Structures are given as structure tokens and as C-alpha cells.
């Protein structure tokens, strides 16, 4: 563990040891843009959940 | 004491309206201040200078 | 410097060495709600730029 846990993203700050990143489908501005063409048992997600981008 | 002299405050013209100020950001390349939020939002972008 | 730099802030992550901090007036969610009964040459400002809160 101790310097090994380190979780980093851009910029946002350190977070340490298990967190959670989240696959969904549902996701509005996903869909418009990304999997237009496909259906849900396979289709693109954004894991980054920051609203900014 | 009652007057509009009481509520409103007499002063110079300034043709400008008010100097306001604008908000530099260079987002892709430089560490996003404070306790700013990284975004992509364009309007919400992190800001590394002000200037009037 | 070393282990004297770090500039934290909630969870926003670690920033290293002089960042910069701002103290504005024309902030539109500050007028409304604290220096409503002030004026520009006695103020408060939210030094927190930070979108959610």
C-alpha cells in the first residue's frame, strides 16, 4: 500500500485507495454524441464523470 | 436626510460605462488554480489571469 | 519546499507551490446573496471558485 494506492485523474486531486468508476448507458450526453448507432448490449460510456468536459 | 441626495450618490460621467474586466484561460496548458474545477465547459474554464 | 508546498483544498486534489486566489466583486452569486447591503469599497467575496457549492 503505502506510496502504491495513488488513484489519479487530471488536475482533481489525489484520491486514495479503492474508489468507483461507473459504466452506464443512460448517460445523456453520451448517447447523442457516442453510440448513436448501436443498442445496449454494446455501446461506448464515458467513465469520466466531470461535469466540465 | 429624504431627498434622492439620500438613496443615489452624484458622480463623475465616464464615458467607458464601467471598466470591467475579462478572464485569460489556457486551460490545456496550465495547472488549474486554486480551487478551481477542470471542465470542458467553455464557459467555466479554469482562469489564470484577470485583467481590465 | 519539499514536503512544504502542497496548497489543498476538499478533495479538489493537491496543487504544489504559489497558485493564485481571487477577491472580486462582480461575482453574481456573492451580490445577491451576502453583500446585498454593502457597497464595492466594503464587500464580502467567496474566494471559492469552485461551480457547486
Not at chain 1, 486514495?16 to 448507432?37: G, I
Amino acid at each position: 500500500t503505502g506510496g502504491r494506492n495513488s488513484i489519479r485523474y487530471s488536475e482533481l486531486a489525489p484520491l486514495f485507495d479503492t474508489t468507483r468508476v461507473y459504466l452506464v448507458d443512460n448517460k445523456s450526453t453520451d448517447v447523442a454524441s457516442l453510440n448513436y448507432q448501436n443498442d445496449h448490449s454494446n455501446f461506448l460510456t464515458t467513465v469520466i464523470q466531470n461535469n466540465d468536459y | 436626510q429624504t431627498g434622492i441626495r439620500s438613496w443615489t450618490l452624484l458622480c463623475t460621467p465616464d464615458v467607458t460605462c464601467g471598466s470591467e474586466q475579462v478572464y485569460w484561460s489556457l486551460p490545456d496548458m496550465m495547472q488549474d488554480p486554486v480551487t478551481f474545477r477542470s471542465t470542458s465547459q467553455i464557459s467555466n474554464f479554469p482562469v489564470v489571469g484577470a485583467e481590465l
